[PDB]
Design a protein around this ligand. Structure first.
Ligand SMILES: [Zn+2]
Lengths: 50, 63, 40, 129
């Protein structure tokens, strides 16, 4: 079905920013590395727990 | 470090000397100066320090 | 009962090991034997 | 010779401004145990707290009941529900919850824990269903 209003469509230069969701996403289970001092999980995805 | 100045006579107040000085303070003086009986100055000098549990110094603070 | 260490138990129990989980499981009953996340 | 990992010396500047005599007996020094308390339950007609459960109290009752049904499970409910949370919620709604709510009004210096005991089975329930 056609839209009742004409739509502004045209070529626009777009840039893919290097913020990948596959690198930013993180999910951890109830286990993993813990700090020897506090016993708390380590910090962030890089340490594989936290 | 504490220094004892007796009109120019300079002598170092060592922790042993300080403990000797503080051990002569009565609890009456401690109370009348607004301090608790658990805050006697004799506790300010330590001949036996506490090495903390290894739980707070995992394998630097042990150096 | 021998008061063995966790590492000693993990080494000795590495005969029932089957097959990030960080845990070994029994080859017979699939029970958690021990865990190995990092060696200190 | 160049060290990069400095520790950033830390400074506190605002000073606080909080506003016979024998060595020590076995009473003034010590006795950290704190004397035991007796439970002074306010009579039901002298209670001043609300006869309606707060959402905090109802939520805590449901959570406690559901956690207990996790290990137990002998239930007085008629209809069968497949989760302890639903069972506890229906127990609260059907006024069959086996718990009581104690509201500690005051702890007296003499060693009395003045409390109001409220029965959730005669109380107003604010939860949704
Ligand atoms: Zn097994």
């Amino acid at each position: 079905e056609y839209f009742d209003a004409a739509i502004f469509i045209g070529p626009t230069y777009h840039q893919r920013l290097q913020k990948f969701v596959l690198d930013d996403r993180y999910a951890v289970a109830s286990y993993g590395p813990t700090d020897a001092l506090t016993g708390q999980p380590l910090d962030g995805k890089r340490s594989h727990g936290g | 470090t504490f220094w004892a100045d007796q009109q120019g006579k300079i002598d170092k107040l060592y922790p042993q000397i300080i403990r000797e000085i503080f051990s002569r303070v009565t609890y009456d003086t401690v109370v009348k100066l607004g301090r608790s009986k658990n805050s006697h100055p004799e506790k300010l000098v330590l001949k036996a320090i506490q090495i903390p549990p290894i739980s707070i110094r995992p394998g630097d603070i042990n150096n | 009962a021998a008061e063995a260490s966790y590492d000693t138990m993990r080494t000795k129990l590495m005969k029932f090991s089957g097959i990030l989980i960080y845990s070994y499981f029994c080859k017979i009953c699939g029970e958690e034997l021990a865990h190995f996340i990092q060696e200190d | 010779l160049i060290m990069d990992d400095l520790v950033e010396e830390y400074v506190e500047t605002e000073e606080e401004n909080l506003v016979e005599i024998v060595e020590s007996p076995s009473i003034c020094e010590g006795f950290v145990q704190a004397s035991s308390q007796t439970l002074v339950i306010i009579p039901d007609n002298e209670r001043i707290t609300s006869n309606v459960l707060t959402t905090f109290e109802a939520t805590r009752l449901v959570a406690v009941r559901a956690q207990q049904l996790a290990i137990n499970g002998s239930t007085m409910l008629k209809k069968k529900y497949s989760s302890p949370i639903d069972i506890a919620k229906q127990e609260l709604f059907n006024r069959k919850i086996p718990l009581l709510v104690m509201r500690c009004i005051k702890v007296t210096p003499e060693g009395q824990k003045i409390v109001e005991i409220w029965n959730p089975r005669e109380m107003g329930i604010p939860l949704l269903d």
